[PDB]
């Protein structure tokens, strides 16, 4: 239930935000944690170590994609000098 | 109830309803962990067949092994009880020495070798039950018959010897 509310918070990050692109990166991190938390709790209910394994690979991949996204942001910011959307 | 490890239990639920009379009664084993552990290989020596038969009965009836293996469950309790009756009538002092050492030493069998060797000898000379561990490396002395223990907190004195039957 908490995991569902957290997914909304990550969803709501995209609704409320017109100009903060950094918040877009953070809202993906919230969504991914919410989905991993749901898998972890379900894996506990169904006594299944595969759920924990799936969550570990989501942490690995979401950590890997955070680094790519920050690198892409750095290449973007090197040329623009701002992460602000003019709106 | 489920075999899940609890994390938030604050209560214990008991049920006083007995077993139906149609099921033959049985006296449950009344021995604590440490005595059971000092007598485990002795129980294994005498009741291995009944232990195996009980486990095989359950495997023959998957999902139903609790029921329809009760009669074989009762045998395993009686045989083990015979070993704890025989030991308590013939090796009581040596038995209490080993399980009291075990209870004081984190139930680690390698911490109480002198007390074990004394009991092993007495049990063998009255009950003909001998400790056996399958598949120990043939190129080394059996770990339970080694004069020195690497992981022992106190060094085994040199006047306390392992019990090898036939010597």
């Amino acid at each position: 239930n908490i995991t569902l509310i957290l997914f909304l918070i990550g969803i709501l990050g995209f609704v409320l935000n017109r100009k903060n692109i950094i918040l877009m990166l953070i809202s993906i991190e919230i969504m991914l944690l919410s989905i991993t938390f749901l898998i972890l709790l379900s894996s506990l209910n169904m006594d299944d170590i595969i759920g924990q394994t799936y969550a570990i690979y989501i942490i690995v991949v979401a950590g890997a994609e955070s680094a790519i996204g920050l690198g892409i942001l750095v290449a973007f910011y090197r040329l623009r000098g701002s992460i602000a959307i003019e709106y | 109830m489920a075999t899940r490890k609890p994390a938030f239990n604050q209560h214990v639920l008991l049920d006083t309803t007995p077993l139906p009379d149609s099921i033959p009664k049985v006296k449950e084993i009344g021995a604590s962990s440490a005595p059971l552990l000092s007598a485990s290989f002795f129980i294994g020596a005498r009741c291995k067949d009944y232990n195996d038969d009980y486990m095989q009965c359950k495997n023959e009836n998957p999902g139903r092994g609790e029921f329809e293996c009760l009669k074989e469950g009762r045998r395993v309790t009686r045989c083990a009880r015979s070993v704890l009756k025989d030991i308590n009538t013939h090796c009581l002092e040596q038995f209490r020495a080993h399980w009291q050492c075990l209870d004081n030493n984190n139930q680690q069998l390698w911490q109480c070798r002198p007390a074990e060797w004394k009991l092993n000898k007495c049990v063998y000379e009255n009950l003909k039950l001998e400790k056996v561990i399958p598949d120990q490396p043939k190129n080394s002395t059996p770990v339970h018959l080694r004069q020195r223990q690497i992981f022992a907190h106190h060094a085994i004195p040199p006047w306390e010897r392992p019990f090898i039957p036939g010597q």
Binding site: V74, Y77, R78, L79, R80, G81, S82, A84, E86 | -
Partner: protein, 75 residues
């Protein structure tokens, strides 16, 4: 001094009434300045000056940023 006391709470209901039969700065050749002339001077060190707090960049500012590299890639 907590800035708060019984006779101080009472003092805040009272309103400064100026005696008309008393010498003023006039008699001394002085002209007092108004407090609104001094707030900026005395409170300037209390206004935040972090880069986070400047108002948004003008289009003049947005265009000049594109004349600079904003990360040292060789370092």
């Amino acid at each position: 001094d907590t800035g708060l006391s019984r006779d101080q709470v009472e003092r805040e209901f009272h309103d400064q009434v100026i005696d008309p039969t008393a010498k003023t700065f006039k008699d001394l050749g002085m002209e007092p300045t108004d407090i609104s002339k001094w707030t900026y001077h005395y409170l300037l060190p209390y206004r935040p000056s972090t880069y986070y707090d400047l108002p948004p960049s003008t289009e003049k500012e947005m265009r000049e940023e594109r004349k600079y590299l904003h990360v040292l890639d060789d370092q």
